[PDB]
Amino acid sequence: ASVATAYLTLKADQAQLQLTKDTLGTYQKSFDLTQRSYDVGVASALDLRQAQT
Amino acid sequence: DQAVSKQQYADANAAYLQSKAAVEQARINLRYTKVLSPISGRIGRSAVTEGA
């Protein structure tokens, strides 16, 4: 029972690690879109800081 | 420090210049309420008087 629970929590943590990596990718795409929209002056230095956080 | 965008600074500057044009409209209209003589010379007599 213990080795079954350990293998299943290993698979679950690898799956949600992959999902967290995909959310990091989408957040990085949001950040460099906001950085592109910050240099020319559409977005101020508040939405850029929110995307950075 | 860019705590406000350049877009909503150019919008506010455009609103300021447009309102300054709309108030100098009323300033030259007050300049038209009083009657300024356009050229210099011998003025004749008044065709309409005070109160007409």
PDB file of N, CA, C and O in Angstrom, chain A residues 38 40-46, chain B residues 1-8:
ATOM      1  N   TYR A  38       4.757  48.352 -23.139  1.00  0.00           N
ATOM      2  CA  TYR A  38       5.236  49.365 -22.208  1.00  0.00           C
ATOM      3  C   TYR A  38       6.230  50.336 -22.826  1.00  0.00           C
ATOM      4  O   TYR A  38       6.276  51.500 -22.414  1.00  0.00           O
ATOM      5  N   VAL A  40       6.457  51.610 -25.971  1.00  0.00           N
ATOM      6  CA  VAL A  40       5.884  52.650 -26.823  1.00  0.00           C
ATOM      7  C   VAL A  40       4.890  53.535 -26.092  1.00  0.00           C
ATOM      8  O   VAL A  40       4.519  54.592 -26.616  1.00  0.00           O
ATOM      9  N   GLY A  41       4.437  53.135 -24.906  1.00  0.00           N
ATOM     10  CA  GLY A  41       3.649  54.000 -24.056  1.00  0.00           C
ATOM     11  C   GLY A  41       2.172  53.685 -23.934  1.00  0.00           C
ATOM     12  O   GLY A  41       1.426  54.530 -23.428  1.00  0.00           O
ATOM     13  N   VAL A  42       1.719  52.509 -24.371  1.00  0.00           N
ATOM     14  CA  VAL A  42       0.309  52.162 -24.209  1.00  0.00           C
ATOM     15  C   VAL A  42       0.010  51.821 -22.755  1.00  0.00           C
ATOM     16  O   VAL A  42      -0.939  52.344 -22.158  1.00  0.00           O
ATOM     17  N   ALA A  43       0.814  50.946 -22.163  1.00  0.00           N
ATOM     18  CA  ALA A  43       0.653  50.546 -20.775  1.00  0.00           C
ATOM     19  C   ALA A  43       1.662  51.279 -19.904  1.00  0.00           C
ATOM     20  O   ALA A  43       2.811  51.486 -20.305  1.00  0.00           O
ATOM     21  N   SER A  44       1.230  51.662 -18.707  1.00  0.00           N
ATOM     22  CA  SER A  44       2.084  52.379 -17.770  1.00  0.00           C
ATOM     23  C   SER A  44       2.983  51.393 -17.032  1.00  0.00           C
ATOM     24  O   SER A  44       3.085  50.214 -17.382  1.00  0.00           O
ATOM     25  N   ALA A  45       3.643  51.867 -15.978  1.00  0.00           N
ATOM     26  CA  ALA A  45       4.494  51.023 -15.150  1.00  0.00           C
ATOM     27  C   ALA A  45       3.757  50.463 -13.943  1.00  0.00           C
ATOM     28  O   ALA A  45       4.352  50.318 -12.871  1.00  0.00           O
ATOM     29  N   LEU A  46       2.464  50.179 -14.081  1.00  0.00           N
ATOM     30  CA  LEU A  46       1.685  49.501 -13.051  1.00  0.00           C
ATOM     31  C   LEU A  46       1.209  48.133 -13.512  1.00  0.00           C
ATOM     32  O   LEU A  46       1.341  47.148 -12.770  1.00  0.00           O
TER      33      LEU A  46
ATOM     34  N   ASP B   1       8.203  59.553 -14.172  1.00  0.00           N
ATOM     35  CA  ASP B   1       8.540  58.212 -13.721  1.00  0.00           C
ATOM     36  C   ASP B   1       7.657  57.171 -14.401  1.00  0.00           C
ATOM     37  O   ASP B   1       7.758  55.980 -14.082  1.00  0.00           O
ATOM     38  N   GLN B   2       6.811  57.604 -15.347  1.00  0.00           N
ATOM     39  CA  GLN B   2       5.859  56.764 -16.090  1.00  0.00           C
ATOM     40  C   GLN B   2       4.922  55.991 -15.169  1.00  0.00           C
ATOM     41  O   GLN B   2       4.628  54.818 -15.397  1.00  0.00           O
ATOM     42  N   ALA B   3       4.426  56.660 -14.130  1.00  0.00           N
ATOM     43  CA  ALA B   3       3.331  56.108 -13.348  1.00  0.00           C
ATOM     44  C   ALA B   3       1.985  56.282 -14.038  1.00  0.00           C
ATOM     45  O   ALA B   3       0.981  55.756 -13.550  1.00  0.00           O
ATOM     46  N   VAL B   4       1.946  57.012 -15.148  1.00  0.00           N
ATOM     47  CA  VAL B   4       0.772  57.120 -16.004  1.00  0.00           C
ATOM     48  C   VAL B   4       1.267  57.023 -17.444  1.00  0.00           C
ATOM     49  O   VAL B   4       2.400  57.414 -17.747  1.00  0.00           O
ATOM     50  N   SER B   5       0.454  56.423 -18.314  1.00  0.00           N
ATOM     51  CA  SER B   5       0.898  56.099 -19.666  1.00  0.00           C
ATOM     52  C   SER B   5       1.074  57.356 -20.510  1.00  0.00           C
ATOM     53  O   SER B   5       0.499  58.409 -20.225  1.00  0.00           O
ATOM     54  N   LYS B   6       1.888  57.234 -21.563  1.00  0.00           N
ATOM     55  CA  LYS B   6       2.022  58.326 -22.523  1.00  0.00           C
ATOM     56  C   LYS B   6       0.758  58.505 -23.351  1.00  0.00           C
ATOM     57  O   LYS B   6       0.499  59.605 -23.853  1.00  0.00           O
ATOM     58  N   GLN B   7      -0.029  57.436 -23.514  1.00  0.00           N
ATOM     59  CA  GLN B   7      -1.294  57.531 -24.237  1.00  0.00           C
ATOM     60  C   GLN B   7      -2.291  58.413 -23.498  1.00  0.00           C
ATOM     61  O   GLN B   7      -2.860  59.348 -24.078  1.00  0.00           O
ATOM     62  N   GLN B   8      -2.498  58.145 -22.211  1.00  0.00           N
ATOM     63  CA  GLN B   8      -3.382  58.949 -21.383  1.00  0.00           C
ATOM     64  C   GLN B   8      -2.677  60.158 -20.779  1.00  0.00           C
ATOM     65  O   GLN B   8      -3.220  60.788 -19.867  1.00  0.00           O
TER      66      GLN B   8
END
